[PDB]
Design brief:
repeat; Methylamine Dehydrogenase, Chain H; monomer; five-stranded mixed β-sheet
Length: 1127
Amino acid sequence: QILPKVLHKRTLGLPAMSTTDLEAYFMSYNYVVTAQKPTAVNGCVTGHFTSAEDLNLLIAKNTRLEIYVVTAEGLRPVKEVGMYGKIAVMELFRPKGESKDLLFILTAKYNACILEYKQSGESIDIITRAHGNVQDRIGRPSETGIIGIIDPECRMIGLRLYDGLFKVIPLDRDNKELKAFNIRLEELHVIDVKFLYGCQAPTICFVYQDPQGRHVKTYEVSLREKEFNKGPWKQENVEAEASMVIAVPEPFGGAIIIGQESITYHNGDKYLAIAPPIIKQSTIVCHNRVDPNGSRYLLGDMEGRLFMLLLEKEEQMDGTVTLKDLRVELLGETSIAECLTYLDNGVVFVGSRLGDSQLVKLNVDSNEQGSYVVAMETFTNLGPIVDMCVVDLERQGQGQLVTCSGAFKEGSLRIIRNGIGIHEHDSIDLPGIKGLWPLRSDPNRETDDTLVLSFVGQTRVLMLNGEEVEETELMGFVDDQQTFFCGNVAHQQLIQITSASVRLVSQEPKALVSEWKEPQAKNISVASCNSSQVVVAVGRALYYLQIHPQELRQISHTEMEHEVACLDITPLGDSNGLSPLCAIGLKTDISARILKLPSFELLHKEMLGGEIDPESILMTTFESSHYLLCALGDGALFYFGLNIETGLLSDRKKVTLGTQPTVLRTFRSLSTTNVFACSDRPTVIYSSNHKLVFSNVNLKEVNYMCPLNSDGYPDSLALANNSTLTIGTIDEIQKLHIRTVPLYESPRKICYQEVSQCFGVLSSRIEVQTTALRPSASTQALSSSVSSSKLEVEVHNLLIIDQHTFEVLHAHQFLQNEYALSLVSCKLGKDPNTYFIVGTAMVYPEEAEPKQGRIVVFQYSDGKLQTVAEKEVKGAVYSMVEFNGKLLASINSTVRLYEWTTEKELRTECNHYNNIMALYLKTKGDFILVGDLMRSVLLLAYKPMEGNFEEIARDFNPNWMSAVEILDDDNFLGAENAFNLFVCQKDSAATTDEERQHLQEVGLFHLGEFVNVFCHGSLVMQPTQGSVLFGTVNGMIGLVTSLSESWYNLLLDMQNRLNKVIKSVGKIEHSFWRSFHTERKTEPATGFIDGDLIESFLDISRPKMQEVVAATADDLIKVVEELTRIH
């Protein structure tokens, strides 16, 4: 019950001392949105939800629900939904007379629902069979949280929510409101509870604690008269640390109780126990049944070890089987598991809250070092985000996030970056280029070695002998007038389809063979040539010629009613070059039209909105569903569906992009190759599950592309600009890119020091009584040092990390029993050098409140780390900032200001000690905002004349704060530990003595996450004003911004009209979800607008869109699309 460690647990989310014990021991307009969805796993189940012959895995994040189908290769995604609440219970069950299972869900605000998966055609819905709210007016929530269980015969549902009460929900075909009733329990402290198998009336078994140890007991539930009757067997005694109850299935029956160094089996009178030595070291957390009999079980530790529990049975000579013994075997090591589930055929899913989750295989024969476990996949988890910083290493106008993530063995550093990343190698400034093609200089040799530029009105054939550039045109091509395509198809030929003529050329003789010229002297507008044929179009008409060895043949010819804008050709499957289908785009009546290749026979047509002519179009194959993408001269990017057999009109919904028109042409990165679209921002359209990526590129701009696969440029692609050529190799595709650096120990704080080009990271590790546990970064440092002051264990270190290769340059080890709490890096006074300043405290087991600490000043030099000054202090050092040239530090309910003299010392200036436990500290100009432990906020000022502190204002209304930020000169933002956000403001009232010593809470919001850190910055290059990022315990990243008044009114009206139309999954009301909620109060939200709902307006259908804001549809599409580009 020492404060630093309990606060660290709160920072990671582990069960901490309840706040009540801590008590005993003693006019604004904002906009909030999400940039990265939560990633930690709270729960997970398996079953038959989608159909009767499917095996499903269902995963719960904080407010997300994900559904996967289990195949022989791994997992496949089918749906993902978001709920208006925090999921606390999730169970599958199947009533009699049902084809498949239904899902029960309970929310942390006590919303209950039953859901069913209904997939009819190609569309998928989640329908709500019943819904209600099960909250009690009077009572207090218990420890160990909420518990929910289901009878094996689907007769009732049992809930433990409060103390001294057991809530029962009957499960008959009536009860669409989930009416419940309470049964009184004599036992006021229940540890775990479950329903027993193979009984006649619903039987319940549970473990409780009271003076004289903890016990296990049973009951029978009579839902016909609302009372417990009596259990099948009496009450026993169990180990003082019994915590887990398992109900064994039918052939055995009975219960298995798990504690520490004991595993026990009770069934009526039968009783067995084992105490295998391996269980001593660490605690078992989770369990899962492998065999439907109940013949094997999996168990997982707090340190990552995975065990199998075996029940060996005895066949009776005439009676039912019994069991004789129990056995435990160490299987191996994984990540610490919050959820463990078993899938099928020796495959296990390990779901984690403090590390990456992963998919594992169990072998029958131990490999080297005797392990049965072999990893298969990992899924990234940003973990608890305990601290982060914004850094712009490469000196463009775009920053990156660097965060400390994870815990004990899973601790790491994460780098988060925006966009698609190319790595320019041959950078030369060439002005405007009209296009770009390859050319083959040899027979069909391996990767190409020649390229063709094309300028505003010209095409020039280069040569490429490696990294160098050279110009040497073979004397058979064009050099002064633009060609539409010059590439290759097959069979020892070259294409030259010019606006002057069409051609076939010899490559081995490098000579001309034959030519064909337009017999109208009228110049072509747009052509197309894919990989075996060319299709062209002139005036109002369209030719089509197949390219055959050594000559040309006319294969099709037909005029179009309107003037051709563009064409395309591509074989999309079992067709080796010849594409039976073809599409046409038009200027005047903007319309995509389907026309067969062989004879230009009419197939169909479809029109659109707008007037400006399109700039590009392609037919695209990425999945089993083909697409036709057109790109217009305004910024709209339209997509239509292709069924290559018939071609019935598939999905559509309008969109805008950047100001310049878009050019779309296909790239290569994987055998599931996708398309790239050139605009003001190059934009990949890639396949993720079935939808479209719209990710930008870390690039100024590009117009027209051509892939490059040469030996020195293995998977590159040359892109042209108004004045640039841009080439590089492709990283990931999605919007955010995450890079991981493993540390093998817990990080706590991070800070950046530019003039050194390094990071400083505080870290900690655990050591047995002290030798070793495993190699870590604090151990394998390049250099190392130990403190030499003269004024399990945890060992704290300061790590100096290189910013390029991300390796540990140096490690400093602090004194014994010393906890480093805060870190800063700055310049003080008139000294020119920049230091690393660290604040610590000395932590002892018996006593309850630290009473000493240091403030150490380090200088990192050419290759070493020195020490400059020490300044022992009488208390813990919770935070410090660099104020103006001085140092501001909070010492154990006091705030103090220090000065850096010419002797390289620090000297005290002034103090303020009215608060209690000042934890957080932020500064702006001459004001200081102090965030208290349980005393809301406090605003202070520094008076340069008298050189001391003056208390300007204080906020009443107790609040258990967890983070603090300064928005501008007058609005202060705070996050509290019940998952709420609030905004305070300085009251402008008369009577200048008393009511100006008040801050008014002018904004309230319920977020649903636990905020750990705020920081000023943004992730995009270069309506709204300001930008603050925050990070949470579940791994979510969010963004807060300020608005005007007219915009706030507009969007609030929009919010009401939107949630009058959208259907919520469990039929929860958005207004109820976002209300400010603590045990002491509940008020409607005000002063906040949430952008998740607003951004969902772009996913709605055209008729539903006009119902909202019934003042045009596009007039609001523009606004929302503008808002979408903030993050």
